[PDB]
Amino acid sequence: MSKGEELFTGVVPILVELDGDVNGHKFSVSGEGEGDATYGKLTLKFICTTGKLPVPWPTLVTTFVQCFSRYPDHMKRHDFFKSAMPEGYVQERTIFFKDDGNYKTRAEVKFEGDTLVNRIELKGIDFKEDGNILGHKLEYNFNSHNVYIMADKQKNGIKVNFKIRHNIEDGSVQLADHYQQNTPIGDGPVLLPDNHYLSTQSALSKDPNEKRDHMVLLEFVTAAGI
């Protein structure tokens, strides 16, 4: 008994498209890969189509499909993400980079045929031209962490909150505080959950054969706290 549940039974193709502007720095990213919600597994490869990425890849990871999360059988009734499919949902965010600029994001996640699409437009402002971000002082990696989920309303969506800790080259750490809201695109029914969280793990890599600026990402996500 689940609208979107059936959709995530096998390996689903993913298409990611982002349009960003950060301090007047305009760029575009395209991504392709697949997801297997059974294992909470994701494999994506991103390419900066406009040349060299103005910001650091690691800062984009979170922006670049939580419907691929693995919900244990006992927690299935809490899967809002899959429940909004195939119609989709809106994922909006504000990411405050401590002592630096912020990112404003608005994405739409939905199926286009049998392809899971993530269409995003990002807006970045107040960045320090010499900060860790514009300054590119961030390490090419990513730490594990949790994602906190809570419902919003009685038919509406969810609010999610969490912090990312980006490692700097000097051993220090750059904080990225995420504020996120999700709203279903249709007028159909959706699963509203009790509080829980998602335990995420990500590995960033590079493709030796790839001459363009890009990032290879492997992510594993599993619901818990219930």
Side-chain angles (χ1 to χ4, degrees), residues 2 4-5 7-103 105-152 156-158 160-168 170-180 182-208 210-226:
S2 187
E5 234 169 69
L7 260 33
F8 299 91
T9 247
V11 173
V12 170
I14 307 162
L15 218 218
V16 175
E17 304 290 348
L18 164 131
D19 276 315
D21 178 6
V22 176
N23 277 22
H25 287 91
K26 279 149 202 303
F27 56 104
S28 291
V29 198
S30 218
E32 299 182 0
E34 22 199 48
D36 197 348
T38 302
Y39 309 78
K41 194 188 203 159
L42 274 182
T43 313
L44 275 290
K45 173 167 185 212
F46 309 95
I47 298 324
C48 182
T49 50
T50 54
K52 306 241 253 276
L53 199 73
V55 294
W57 286 109
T59 63
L60 300 173
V61 169
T62 63
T63 288
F64 288 158
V65 293
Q66 306 168 309
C67 51
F68 286 103
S69 290
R70 172 167 83 77
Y71 274 67
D73 170 277
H74 73 284
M75 277 178 81
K76 317 232 161 241
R77 85 174 249 244
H78 292 290
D79 196 349
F80 157 91
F81 306 100
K82 280 181 208 63
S83 87
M85 303 294 158
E87 321 87 344
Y89 54 78
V90 187
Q91 183 153 303
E92 265 146 357
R93 264 195 206 127
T94 296
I95 301 170
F96 297 96
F97 291 85
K98 186 171 201 179
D99 307 307
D100 202 331
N102 59 82
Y103 287 164
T105 77
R106 182 220 141 76
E108 288 185 350
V109 352
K110 54 134 114 69
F111 269 98
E112 286 287 23
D114 69 20
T115 296
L116 194 271
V117 178
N118 192 18
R119 241 163 252 165
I120 314 134
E121 45 205 4
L122 174 166
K123 185 100 201 309
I125 75 172
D126 290 337
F127 285 98
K128 283 164 200 196
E129 315 272 352
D130 47 319
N132 289 315
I133 290 82
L134 287 167
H136 294 261
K137 291 170 177 149
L138 263 43
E139 279 192 341
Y140 196 62
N141 55 36
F142 212 81
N143 309 338
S144 300
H145 65 275
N146 303 138
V147 173
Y148 304 91
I149 299 168
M150 327 144 239
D152 199 349
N156 206 333
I158 63 162
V160 182
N161 144 97
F162 65 97
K163 315 195 191 342
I164 293 295
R165 294 264 186 348
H166 296 280
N167 305 155
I168 304 99
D170 65 4
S172 204
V173 88
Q174 170 83 65
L175 195 291
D177 237 279
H178 296 50
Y179 299 68
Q180 157 183 354
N182 295 66
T183 51
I185 295 175
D187 230 327
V190 95
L191 250 23
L192 296 200
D194 301 331
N195 308 17
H196 63 282
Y197 70 88
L198 297 188
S199 139
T200 84
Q201 195 174 139
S202 336
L204 323 193
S205 31
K206 240 65 153 121
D207 181 7
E210 188 45 55
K211 305 281 106 91
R212 288 147 307 162
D213 198 24
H214 62 296
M215 160 186 74
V216 179
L217 159 86
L218 171 83
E219 187 148 288
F220 284 103
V221 182
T222 159
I226 285 168

